[PDB]
Amino acid sequence: GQNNNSNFAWTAGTKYHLNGRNSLANPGIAMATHKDDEERFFPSNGILI
Amino acid sequence: ADGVGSSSGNWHCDSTWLGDRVITTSTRTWALPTYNNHLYKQISNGTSGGATNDNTYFGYSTPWGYFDFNRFHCHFSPRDWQRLINNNWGFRPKRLSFKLFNIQVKEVTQNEGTKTIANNLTSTIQVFTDSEYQLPYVLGSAHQGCLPPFPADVFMIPQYGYLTLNNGSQAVGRSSFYCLEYFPSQMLRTGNNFQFTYTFEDVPFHSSYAHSQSLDRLMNPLIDQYLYYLSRTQTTGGTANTQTLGFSQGGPNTMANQAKNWLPGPCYRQQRVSTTTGQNNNSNFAWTAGTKYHLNGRNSLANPGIAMATHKDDEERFFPSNGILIFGKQNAARDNADYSDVMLTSEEEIKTTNPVATEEYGIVADNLQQQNTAPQIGTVNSQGALPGMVWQNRDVYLQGPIWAKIPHTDGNFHPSPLMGGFGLKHPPPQILIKNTPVPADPPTTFNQSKLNSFITQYSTGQVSVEIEWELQKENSKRWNPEIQYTSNYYKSTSVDFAVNTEGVYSEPRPIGTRYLTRNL
Amino acid sequence: FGKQNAARDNADYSDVMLTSEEEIKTTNPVATEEYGIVADNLQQQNTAPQIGTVNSQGALPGMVWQNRDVYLQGPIWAKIPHTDGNFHPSPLMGGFG
Amino acid sequence: EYFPSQMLRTGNNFQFTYTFEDVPFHSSYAHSQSLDRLMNPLIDQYLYYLSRTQTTGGTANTQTLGFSQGGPNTMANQAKNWLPGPCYRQQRVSTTT
Amino acid sequence: EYQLPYVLGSAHQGCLPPFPADVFMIPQYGYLTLNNGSQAVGRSSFYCL
Amino acid sequence: YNNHLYKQISNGTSGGATNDNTYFGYSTPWGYFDFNRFHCHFSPRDWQR
Amino acid sequence: KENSKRWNPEIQYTSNYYKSTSVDFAVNTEGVYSEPRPIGTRYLTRNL
Amino acid sequence: ADGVGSSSGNWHCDSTWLGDRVITTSTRTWALPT
Structure with a gap:
């Protein structure tokens, strides 16, 4: 219920461009998943699942 | 025993291939003019003219001159460059030798409208290497004046100069002035020669290959991943679409979504x-x-x-x-x-x-x-x-620069020269040459001011450079044939990489080193 | 200072x-x-x-x-943090890492 | 208090020695050249740069490609x-x- | 001698199972090379095992 | 696999695929071993130790 | 071994640079290996 | 062996510092009239 009502997984994804071809940056560089008391949040393509 | 009647060197131009090494040798003929009438001069550019602030400078032009062998076609014929690039994954320089010989100093006097040229057998020239890197290093800026690619051309030696700190056209207190006469140098008459050797430091092989894979296509195209990605934020196929979380494994039909x-x-x-x-x-x-x-x-x-x-x-x-x-x-x-x-x-x-x-x-x-x-x-x-x-890195070309000096700094990141080449902390040292001034007749009464009248003079000779190169052999299980550099088969008015009817040598197009391929 | x-x-x-x-x-x-x-x-x-x-x-x-210069009034050294990776570990207040 | 320590009365002393690890010299100098001024001010480059995208000096200026060698009067354009x-x-x- | 495209390292299914009593199927080997669309270019390599 | 054959395999925009997903390559008759996950080598108890 | 003082570059056998539906000297989608064209051995040159 | 074609000296201009001593060397070019 807290997310935006849209299908943004690909359009809002974090990506890199190579030779005219877009690749999702997954999981990407190592970054902290969330801050204090924000366990319910995660990066869109930033973690292992 | 050296004398006027005996030559001090022989002509050496050859390429030798020995399994994992190739040795190149070149000889050219040069002419050295007197620059600046034997003077050092302050030179500068400022906004007082039409120049903009981006182009200002302050520096000095010396009477000296220098040798530059820092392009690849100095050392390789087009055919030898073909042998290199079609069969080797990589290469790097190892050691070099330099020789200067068969010196001739000549004097030119001009009376009325006639001009005559004669030998001056007792004149000298001065040569030294800066092997402690105590001078500003101007090699590495891709300047004109190297040895010519074609061995029969005679080339002029370029004038040495340098820049220091400026503010506009003015100089600041940290600006340095250098006198090239403050270094020990060897003096040569017509029967003397000069030589030295140099060893390159360990440097990575230049990569002379192209990748047969792309970085985003390293996966097995048959098999799925065990990792998941977020594939759905919203419900689909309904009267009112709502928020949801959906996950999928990455696989053959979605490569852009896989974890890498x-x-x-x-x-x-x-x-x-x-x-x-x-x-x-x-x-x-x-x-x-x-x-x-x-x-x-x-x-x-x-x-x-x-x-x-x-x-x-x-x-x-x-x-x-x-x-x-x-x-x-x-x-x-x-x-x-x-x-x-x-x-x-x-x-x-x-x-x-x-x-x-x-x-x-x-x-x-x-x-x-x-x-x-x-x-x-x-x-x-x-x-x-x-x-x-x-x-x-960027590729190297037969017409391009071989090396650059890495600036002396606290830190650098990946010090490969951006025009392409081998970055070196201690590059091949720069080689300075000058005609020794010969005064004209002084007055018969003493005068303290420095003499400003001299005999017009210039010199010529031959120079040899030899470089040993280490080769990295290609070892590949690729089944199909590779891409290779080749000359055109069809007929034409002239041959590429040859002289024309006039006798002008030309280079048709730039040639890189990337033909063979390797896996990523 | x-x-x-x-x-x-x-x-x-x-x-x-x-x-x-x-x-x-x-x-x-x-x-x-x-x-x-x-x-x-x-x-x-x-x-x-x-x-x-x-x-x-x-x-x-x-x-x-x-790097940044050192001063007669300034710090000499710093301890480099113990980590998986660092880039050019010279202390930013100046000194020897 | 969970570490072993030496105890000293008024007649006791304490000492130890330490060796620094290899570390680069602090650079105590200023450069007499700037990074964009490492070229020889007398000589031209053999490389070219794009110096013109448009025709000049005409009734109607049009698209074109022009190239020049970098040299003493244009240092901001040279390859580095x-x-x-x-x-x-x-x-x-x-x-x- | 690392003369083949290395497909290990992409987190594919088909490793040894975590539980020692399971019997597993061996995965099929394949590889990719350079492409333009669905076509191949001249640098594309073919390998015979 | 593949009835003992090597096969050219590719994906292009001629289908519904987008430009980001195109590829060209080969599927071999061979197969390979993969031990590259940690639970191949460690029991949950050994991972705890 | 070839030992030659020729200055200009030689003619060499090479694969085509441009894109194509398949790779030359490889299998096709079916799995049939084919040989595109005959290849001789005369590329390097010698004086008469 | 000295001859017309061989130089009899080299150019030496340097300063060397060695703890308690310094050594200077200079070379110049001169002209002598009658």
Whole structure:
């Protein structure tokens, strides 16, 4: 219920461009998943699942 | 025993291949003029003229001159360059030898309208190497005046000069002045010769290959991943679509979604230009739209810049505005030369791991999505090093520079010269040469001021340079045939890489070193 | 740095001494200016080229730089944190890492 | 108090020695050259740069490509091997309030 | 001698099972090379095992 | 696998695929071993130790 | 071994640079290996 | 062996510092009239 009502997984994804071809940056560089008391949040393509 | 009647050296031009090493040797004939009438001179440029602040300088021009062998065609014939690039994965320099011999000093006197030239057998020349790197190093800026590619040409030795710190056209207190006469040098009459040897430091092999894989295609195309990615934020196929979370495994039909271990190299973005002029914008944007860096209030074009792929697939006609090396054809004009008169290099082979120069690096998030507010993205035009990046350097050409001196600094990142080459802490030392001044007749009464009258004079001789190169052999299980550099089969008015009817040697096009391929 | 007997809080400009890193201008960009200019779009006959200003720039292949200077009043060393990775571990207040 | 320590009365002393690890020399010098001025001011380059996108001196100016060699009067246009160090931009303050 | 495209390292299914009593199927080997669309270019390599 | 054959395999935009997903390559008759996950080598108890 | 003082570059056998539906000297989608064209051995040159 | 074609000396201009001593060397070019 807290997310935006849209299908943004690909359009809002974090990506890199190579030779005219877009690749999702997954999981990407190592970054902290969330801050204090924000366990319910995660990066869109930033973690292992 | 050396004498006027005995030659002090022989002509050596050869290439020798011995399994893992190749040794090149070149000999040329040079002529050295007297520069600046034996004087050091302060030279500077400031805004008081029409010059802008970006172009100001302060420095000195010396009476001396220097040797430059720092282009590859100094050491390789076009055929020898073909043997190298078609069969080896990599190569690097090892050691070198230098010789200076068969010196002739000549004097020219001019009376009325007639001119005569004679030998001066007792004159000398002065030569020294700066092997402690105590002078400003001007080698490495891609200046004219190297040894000619064609062995029968006779070349003029360029004049040495240097720059120091400036403010406008003025000098500051840290500005240094150097006298080349303050170094110990060897003096040679017509029967003397000069030589020294040098060893290169350990340096990585130049990569002379193109990748047969791209960085985003390293997976097995048959098998699924066991990792999941977020594939759905919203319900589909219903009267009212709602929020949900959906996950999928990455697989053959979605490669753009799979998890990967590596990232493309860094990006500093260039403006795109077409060789079809009708497609360009109707404006003079070369300087205003140029890609530049700022240093001490002074703008410098970033040229060629970091190594980036020149264009993407089926876009050969586009090139970065100041992002590539450009060579001139024989007899091409100095200023405002036409497109036909120049040769453009291409870095298309590094597309596999390096981003295209005229495109963005990628996309990142700008805000925090909420039920009330939709997500927003932003474009990354310049990207610094990130953990997990891999990249290739720029290629080397037969017409291009071999090495550069790494600046002496607290820190550097990946010190490969951006015009391409081998970065060296202790490069081959620069070699300085000058005609010794010979005064004319002084007055018969003493005068304290320095003599300003001299005998007009110049010198000639031969110079040899020999370099040993280490080779990295190609070891490959590829089944199908490779791409190789070849000459054209069809008939033509002249032969490429030869003289014409006039006797002018020309180089048809630039030749890189990337033909053989390797897996990523 | 503070002058002798300078206040702890809200000291005047006269009461303090300011260091200068003007000597590294030769290889290091000025702190209050941009790094450079890059392209923003793709020029066409219909659309003019656009540029953008680079305010923060990460390491690029081919960069050279100097560290910050040390002072007679300043720190000598710092301990490098124990981590998986670091980039050019010279202490930013100046010194020996 | 969970570490072993030496206890000293008024007649006791304490000492130890330490060796520094290999570390680069602090650079105590300023450069006499700037990174964008490493070229020989007398000689032209053999490389070319794009100097003209448009025809000049005519009734109607049109698209064209022009190339020039870099030289003494255009140093800002020459090809170079090196780049300035990294940037993280600061706001500017004057000592004249 | 690392003369083949290395497909290990992409987190594919088909490793040895975590539980020692399970019997597993061996995965099929394959590889990718350079492409333009669905076509191949001249640098594309073919390998025979 | 593949009835003992090597086969050319590719994906292009001629179908419904987008440009980001195109590829060209080969599927071999061979197969390979993969031990590259940690639970191949460690029991949950040994991972705890 | 070839030992030659020729200055200009020789003619060499090479694969085509341009894109194509298949790779030369490889299998096709069916799995049939084919040989595109005959290849001789005369590329390097010698004086008469 | 000295001859017309062989130089009899080299150019030496240097300063060397060795703890408690310094050694200077200079070379100049001169002209002598009658």
